[PDB]
């Protein structure tokens, strides 16, 4: 290989392309070796990897991988019996379906021959629930959510019971997880109860149950539902660590959505770690007052300065208090918590393909987001430099600091910032009018970049749309085939019969491929035969 | 009407993203009811109001500032609110793109079908609602047979007119084999 | 040319300021310049930002300098073609 | 010297310059005197840019002795 690489590298690449074109021929694929569908899938994956690596003949390798995918889908398509479908979907557990998902052969997974085999596994042990309306299934989700604890204790006796088989079905597993997630979101909403209509007392007032206690112990104690959220969070964190250990740290960070999910739980832990720290210090001051100072009311006592700090209200709290660190992290986590609906929306028929288009645009935005940043940082530095010497002269401190310049420019994208940020109280028109020119130039630019972003996304859009949703939903289905209880409730501890089918199908593919080739060549072939007859006579 | 049907699907998605920050922003600021300059995220009703009008840009950006010297709470409010605004633009832009793709004499025939339904309601509603308070085969089977013969003939004609070359070449080959 | 116009104005302001500096040490002898009543031309350069003239060379310099920095980041357009992900992104722009 | 490639750029024959036969001849010239740097990830090349940016003055004074040195050939490559 090195000797071939030393001279005439272009011919070397051409020879590799020709050899792979020979390998990826449907004729060679079918006639080359036994189990040609598996060979075609593996060859398609190899060609895709080579297309990634080469970055020069990317279209050639994509075309060859397309040829292999077409061969696989065509061999699958000609099946007319369920035994042929089962043999194709798994060789001598959906062996080939999982291997096709890994290799992004979307038309194979989304083929009608392939989908109907998955739905039978999905809707197992419950036949009448497939024919129900979405409202009835919504009613089932509501029914399962309300009665989830009652059936959970019955799962210990379920293996002997008939109703355990219904619970263990993949659809009832999905309903259990969807119902469980609704419960978790309800907990956050219910944890904010009694503040739906506002707080009852002003922050300047200290209210304690009994005078001898410290005010901070009242605020930093854990309520019953907040202890229940921590158990929910610990269960999710335990599950993530188990998958991290099995799959390895390198592969774990590869998925951007997985990085988003892990940081979300680390944020939640960071929210309660700060909360727990505040509990330790507050009860420490509580232990001090009863131990040493003896009085009926703590207010009349002049406490030590350290102990007397925890008797203060929200007003006198330090800026970097652990409770303040806790509250901000907690709110961020709740915002990320609703992002988990992305795990459930693939199943819904109406909201399934709706989500796919949402994700596709988000990937493009990141590229423009980098460009948006570069233009943003240009005027952010440019505008900050001009006005940094008029900190007291400016009417509005907008571009006085680099932090302030980032704030005023970002909200300008949404039009939420003012236009009087470029005026001075000094009679310096050259500085002021230049501020107008730059700010006006910036605004036209962001419109141009936004308009270009809108146009580029529309072009990037173009049953290709339908097959891509079924491939995403099929990945959702296969996760539940082989995850029994929800995360909250998970803490408790001669050729073959096969080779005959493949040969029969491959003969069918070769016959039909020859038939379709010869049916397209009926006129050309016939005219050659009559000419030979004329030459003979 | 066609776009309105699509909007409902995005409206549910718009709701889910809306309710995410509605609960998220309400939780953060519910403990600064008196400390905040503007009572925007103090109550869940108030959080719904300030987030909805932000879609149309009718709400302020000073709703995330505090009168207390707690930058961690305040700066996180900026991060979430800025994240929310970019998200609604992304969902709106995705909504605009998805509707355009859903668009594609198909346009003409669909209007005539809607207007034809309007016509047929008046065939067999006499007075306006205000003034309504006062109290052998057949002759047919011959036509169908004639038309179906015409369809079979034309379908065969159009099939054989598309197969004039293929059919002729088969006939001459049989002549060669005969002689 | 904007950048040169920014520093040409900046250099001109340096020449006049040190001219007033050369005046004070040469003629008026005192420990502190504040207690001195300077000539009106020389006393002008002792003023703050408040009393500066609208068309001061330093003000002309600062505005041109800021414009140049805005244009300076426009040179990334020479580098973005090489990047694979940001290459075709720029072409549509 | 790519006589015809330059003349095709001047005449806007985009399909000639962008043809796979033509591109593979340019990349070999571009990634000269450094073979393993073509197979690196973008982050590694980003790391290289960061490495070069920090150590730029140190290799600059070494360019006077570079013509005799081996590392001068690496510096003189079009990618570097
Ligand atoms: C694993 C995660 C661990 C997280 C915890 C780690 C660190 C936080 C807690 C440990 C100490 C640092 C915070 C406390 C602090 O000093 O805040 C300072 C301000 O800081 C800000 O302005 C924060 C603004 C950024 C918020 C977004 C990041 C949130 C975490 C990630 C979110 C990702 C984005 C979605 C206090 O300021 P001050 O001195 O009072 O100001 C006086 C004027
Ligand atoms: C080669 C370039 C050379 C540049 C230098 C050339 C000329 C500038 C310096 C020489 C003298 C002229 C400026 C000084 C002046 O009198 O400003 C006057 C106001 O002027 C304005 O309002 C300027 C507004 C336009 C700014 C955009 C052009 C910047 C240069 C091009 C940018 C291109 C766009 C991107 C002062 O006003 P006033 O009397 O104090 O007002 C009292 C009320
Ligand atoms: C021009 C005359 C400027 C006159 C002037 O002195 O000021 C006018 C006023 C203050 O008197 O200030 C203003 O309101 C004017 C603000 C608008 C400035 C003009 C619009 C600039 C549009 C530029 C577009 C560049 C192309 C987009 C960038 C593409 C990059 C990808
Ligand atoms: C980042 C730096 C934040 C610095 C900071 O601490 O604050 C800055 C300022 C208050 O100092 O506050 C602000 O003004 C910043 C507000 C803007 C936040 C940054 C923009 C976020 C864009 C995120 C997009 C996510 C992708 C879209 C979601 C898709 C979901 C379908
Ligand atoms: C794989 C998992 C276990 C990773 C979990 C990481 C956390 C255990 C670490 C990472 C960041 C840490 C936090 C960084 C910031 C703070 C602020 C800190 O606030 C203060 O103590 C300053 C005020 C004071 O006490 O004087 C409290 C600890 C805390 C929450 C730290 C707690 C421990 C955290 C959450
Ligand atoms: C009070 C509301 C308006 C605030 C927002 C709540 C929503 C974010 C949550 C609450 C109930 C959830 C729904 C409960 C029922 C389902 C069933 C499930 O979809 C399916 O039925 C899958 C299709 C199938 O079963 O074959 C998941 C989506 C959906 C609409 C859930 C989507 C997310 C919803 C709308
Ligand atoms: C090919 C290259 C060399 C072209 C470079 C052009 C510059 C050398 C010229 C063009 C415009 C000129 C500028 C036009 C405007 C002014 C404002 C002027 O301000 C004043 O002197 C008025 C205030 C005062 O001193 O009383 C200072 C010179 C300056 C920068 C000029 C300096 C010389 C500049 C930059
Ligand atoms: C602090 C930041 C967020 C403010 C904005 C800074 C950017 C405008 C600058 C800083 C670093 C620069 C990047 C440094 C590394 C590169 C490598 C280079 O791209 C390539 O690697 C070419 C591809 C190849 O080598 O084959 C030029 C683009 C890029 C992303 C640069 C683009 C412009 C960047 C992002
Ligand atoms: Zn070899």
Tab-separated table of C-alpha atoms in Angstrom, chain A residues 212-429:
chain	number	residue	atom	x	y	z
A	212	UNK	CA	-36.132	30.154	70.797
A	213	UNK	CA	-35.514	28.988	67.227
A	214	UNK	CA	-33.344	30.742	64.658
A	215	UNK	CA	-35.038	32.187	61.584
A	216	UNK	CA	-32.747	30.411	59.107
A	217	UNK	CA	-33.695	26.926	60.349
A	218	UNK	CA	-37.287	27.738	59.364
A	219	UNK	CA	-36.311	28.638	55.791
A	220	UNK	CA	-33.624	26.026	55.049
A	221	UNK	CA	-35.473	22.926	56.283
A	222	UNK	CA	-36.595	20.318	53.753
A	223	UNK	CA	-40.314	19.882	53.167
A	224	UNK	CA	-41.782	16.440	52.505
A	225	UNK	CA	-42.143	16.935	48.746
A	226	UNK	CA	-38.627	18.384	48.447
A	227	UNK	CA	-37.224	15.219	50.020
A	228	UNK	CA	-39.300	13.290	47.467
A	229	UNK	CA	-37.743	15.263	44.597
A	230	UNK	CA	-34.232	14.466	45.843
A	231	UNK	CA	-35.039	10.738	45.802
A	232	UNK	CA	-36.322	11.176	42.242
A	233	UNK	CA	-33.131	13.048	41.303
A	234	UNK	CA	-30.894	10.465	42.995
A	235	UNK	CA	-32.585	7.677	41.039
A	236	UNK	CA	-32.024	9.443	37.720
A	237	UNK	CA	-28.409	10.206	38.661
A	238	UNK	CA	-27.802	6.559	39.594
A	239	UNK	CA	-29.129	5.442	36.202
A	240	UNK	CA	-26.864	7.872	34.331
A	241	UNK	CA	-23.756	6.676	36.184
A	242	UNK	CA	-24.512	3.025	35.382
A	243	UNK	CA	-24.777	3.811	31.664
A	244	UNK	CA	-21.603	5.916	31.882
A	245	UNK	CA	-19.629	3.006	33.350
A	246	UNK	CA	-20.864	0.470	30.787
A	247	UNK	CA	-20.417	2.667	27.698
A	248	UNK	CA	-17.234	4.472	28.767
A	249	UNK	CA	-16.414	8.134	29.394
A	250	UNK	CA	-15.335	8.766	25.789
A	251	UNK	CA	-18.567	7.603	24.140
A	252	UNK	CA	-20.687	9.222	26.868
A	253	UNK	CA	-19.629	12.793	26.008
A	254	UNK	CA	-19.949	12.157	22.256
A	255	UNK	CA	-23.718	12.730	22.203
A	256	UNK	CA	-24.609	16.401	22.619
A	257	UNK	CA	-28.033	15.500	24.025
A	258	UNK	CA	-26.410	13.210	26.609
A	259	UNK	CA	-24.092	16.040	27.691
A	260	UNK	CA	-27.180	18.233	28.065
A	261	UNK	CA	-28.924	15.604	30.204
A	262	UNK	CA	-25.972	14.861	32.502
A	263	UNK	CA	-25.374	18.551	33.193
A	264	UNK	CA	-29.062	18.944	34.031
A	265	UNK	CA	-28.834	16.418	36.869
A	266	UNK	CA	-25.494	17.830	38.019
A	267	UNK	CA	-27.291	21.188	38.176
A	268	UNK	CA	-30.030	19.601	40.299
A	269	UNK	CA	-27.422	18.054	42.610
A	270	UNK	CA	-25.648	21.422	42.722
A	271	UNK	CA	-28.997	22.947	43.709
A	272	UNK	CA	-29.569	20.602	46.659
A	273	UNK	CA	-25.919	20.371	47.726
A	274	UNK	CA	-26.012	24.117	48.391
A	275	UNK	CA	-29.415	23.679	50.046
A	276	UNK	CA	-28.128	20.947	52.371
A	277	UNK	CA	-25.076	23.025	53.326
A	278	UNK	CA	-27.346	25.883	54.427
A	279	UNK	CA	-29.258	23.434	56.634
A	280	UNK	CA	-26.104	22.377	58.501
A	281	UNK	CA	-25.087	25.927	59.420
A	282	UNK	CA	-28.585	27.060	60.423
A	283	UNK	CA	-29.115	24.206	62.887
A	284	UNK	CA	-25.609	24.879	64.221
A	285	UNK	CA	-26.791	28.334	65.299
A	286	UNK	CA	-29.974	26.718	66.627
A	287	UNK	CA	-27.843	24.385	68.749
A	288	UNK	CA	-25.971	27.413	70.115
A	289	UNK	CA	-28.924	29.457	71.382
A	290	UNK	CA	-30.596	26.745	73.465
A	291	UNK	CA	-27.253	25.542	74.837
A	292	UNK	CA	-25.839	28.780	76.269
A	293	UNK	CA	-28.195	31.784	76.275
A	294	UNK	CA	-31.221	31.195	78.517
A	295	UNK	CA	-34.270	33.372	77.856
A	296	UNK	CA	-37.924	33.021	76.933
A	297	UNK	CA	-37.619	35.161	73.780
A	298	UNK	CA	-34.568	35.275	71.519
A	299	UNK	CA	-35.355	38.804	70.281
A	300	UNK	CA	-34.460	40.476	73.593
A	301	UNK	CA	-31.061	38.713	73.585
A	302	UNK	CA	-27.931	40.349	72.186
A	303	UNK	CA	-26.420	37.324	70.451
A	304	UNK	CA	-22.816	36.791	69.359
A	305	UNK	CA	-22.193	38.350	65.934
A	306	UNK	CA	-21.809	34.979	64.194
A	307	UNK	CA	-24.896	33.468	65.837
A	308	UNK	CA	-26.910	36.684	65.426
A	309	UNK	CA	-26.329	36.601	61.650
A	310	UNK	CA	-28.733	33.694	61.122
A	311	UNK	CA	-31.474	35.639	62.943
A	312	UNK	CA	-31.597	38.129	60.044
A	313	UNK	CA	-34.190	38.252	57.267
A	314	UNK	CA	-33.799	38.029	53.481
A	315	UNK	CA	-32.612	41.657	53.514
A	316	UNK	CA	-29.414	41.031	55.486
A	317	UNK	CA	-28.379	37.813	53.709
A	318	UNK	CA	-24.953	37.746	52.090
A	319	UNK	CA	-24.790	37.948	48.270
A	320	UNK	CA	-23.068	34.539	48.028
A	321	UNK	CA	-25.300	32.741	50.527
A	322	UNK	CA	-25.634	28.983	49.849
A	323	UNK	CA	-29.427	29.333	49.720
A	324	UNK	CA	-29.156	31.964	46.972
A	325	UNK	CA	-26.773	29.684	45.060
A	326	UNK	CA	-29.312	26.891	45.586
A	327	UNK	CA	-32.362	28.823	44.357
A	328	UNK	CA	-30.779	29.952	41.091
A	329	UNK	CA	-29.498	26.476	40.235
A	330	UNK	CA	-32.875	24.982	41.160
A	331	UNK	CA	-34.722	27.302	38.762
A	332	UNK	CA	-32.313	26.471	35.926
A	333	UNK	CA	-32.947	22.768	36.544
A	334	UNK	CA	-36.726	23.202	36.304
A	335	UNK	CA	-36.290	24.913	32.925
A	336	UNK	CA	-34.193	21.960	31.738
A	337	UNK	CA	-36.610	19.490	33.357
A	338	UNK	CA	-39.353	20.138	30.792
A	339	UNK	CA	-36.783	19.458	28.052
A	340	UNK	CA	-37.264	15.735	28.803
A	341	UNK	CA	-40.551	15.722	26.842
A	342	UNK	CA	-38.238	15.245	23.843
A	343	UNK	CA	-37.959	11.603	24.950
A	344	UNK	CA	-41.742	11.140	24.709
A	345	UNK	CA	-42.863	13.216	21.699
A	346	UNK	CA	-41.495	10.702	19.105
A	347	UNK	CA	-44.267	8.220	19.970
A	348	UNK	CA	-47.100	10.681	19.284
A	349	UNK	CA	-48.270	10.576	15.673
A	350	UNK	CA	-49.281	14.241	15.376
A	351	UNK	CA	-46.318	15.620	17.352
A	352	UNK	CA	-43.798	13.094	16.015
A	353	UNK	CA	-42.709	14.634	12.706
A	354	UNK	CA	-43.301	18.076	14.238
A	355	UNK	CA	-40.294	17.503	16.505
A	356	UNK	CA	-38.019	16.264	13.698
A	357	UNK	CA	-38.196	19.602	11.875
A	358	UNK	CA	-37.513	21.413	15.159
A	359	UNK	CA	-34.273	19.509	15.729
A	360	UNK	CA	-33.038	19.953	12.158
A	361	UNK	CA	-33.221	23.756	12.324
A	362	UNK	CA	-31.494	23.800	15.732
A	363	UNK	CA	-28.423	22.130	14.217
A	364	UNK	CA	-28.220	24.824	11.532
A	365	UNK	CA	-28.709	27.625	14.076
A	366	UNK	CA	-25.534	26.613	15.918
A	367	UNK	CA	-23.519	27.347	12.767
A	368	UNK	CA	-25.208	30.738	12.425
A	369	UNK	CA	-24.932	31.126	16.211
A	370	UNK	CA	-21.146	31.075	15.825
A	371	UNK	CA	-21.479	33.615	13.006
A	372	UNK	CA	-23.982	35.580	15.097
A	373	UNK	CA	-21.364	35.564	17.873
A	374	UNK	CA	-18.588	36.839	15.596
A	375	UNK	CA	-20.665	39.777	14.348
A	376	UNK	CA	-21.955	40.308	17.890
A	377	UNK	CA	-18.446	40.383	19.358
A	378	UNK	CA	-17.345	42.820	16.634
A	379	UNK	CA	-19.712	45.600	17.708
A	380	UNK	CA	-19.577	44.484	21.352
A	381	UNK	CA	-15.880	45.387	21.422
A	382	UNK	CA	-16.357	48.237	18.948
A	383	UNK	CA	-19.188	49.964	20.817
A	384	UNK	CA	-17.614	49.328	24.226
A	385	UNK	CA	-14.355	51.025	23.206
A	386	UNK	CA	-16.054	54.207	21.981
A	387	UNK	CA	-18.181	54.909	25.071
A	388	UNK	CA	-15.868	53.644	27.830
A	389	UNK	CA	-14.501	57.187	28.325
A	390	UNK	CA	-17.961	58.731	28.818
A	391	UNK	CA	-19.057	56.646	31.807
A	392	UNK	CA	-20.378	59.686	33.666
A	393	UNK	CA	-21.159	61.738	30.567
A	394	UNK	CA	-23.575	59.223	29.022
A	395	UNK	CA	-27.222	59.450	30.049
A	396	UNK	CA	-27.597	55.639	30.055
A	397	UNK	CA	-24.715	53.369	31.101
A	398	UNK	CA	-25.071	50.992	28.152
A	399	UNK	CA	-21.608	50.643	26.568
A	400	UNK	CA	-19.523	51.653	29.604
A	401	UNK	CA	-18.373	48.105	30.441
A	402	UNK	CA	-17.794	45.010	28.324
A	403	UNK	CA	-20.411	43.162	30.389
A	404	UNK	CA	-22.815	46.048	29.767
A	405	UNK	CA	-21.990	46.072	26.047
A	406	UNK	CA	-22.889	42.376	25.819
A	407	UNK	CA	-26.237	43.002	27.517
A	408	UNK	CA	-27.420	45.943	25.402
A	409	UNK	CA	-26.402	44.319	22.108
A	410	UNK	CA	-28.025	40.950	22.864
A	411	UNK	CA	-31.452	42.350	23.725
A	412	UNK	CA	-31.302	44.551	20.617
A	413	UNK	CA	-31.759	41.373	18.554
A	414	UNK	CA	-35.257	41.112	20.051
A	415	UNK	CA	-35.751	44.890	19.926
A	416	UNK	CA	-35.940	45.089	23.726
A	417	UNK	CA	-33.219	47.767	24.003
A	418	UNK	CA	-33.414	51.525	23.495
A	419	UNK	CA	-32.011	53.793	20.780
A	420	UNK	CA	-30.995	56.547	23.234
A	421	UNK	CA	-27.905	54.558	24.279
A	422	UNK	CA	-25.779	56.438	21.715
A	423	UNK	CA	-26.351	60.017	22.950
A	424	UNK	CA	-24.021	62.061	25.156
A	425	UNK	CA	-24.484	64.939	27.581
A	426	UNK	CA	-21.316	66.566	26.190
A	427	UNK	CA	-21.282	68.668	23.020
A	428	UNK	CA	-19.235	66.096	21.084
A	429	UNK	CA	-21.186	65.370	17.902
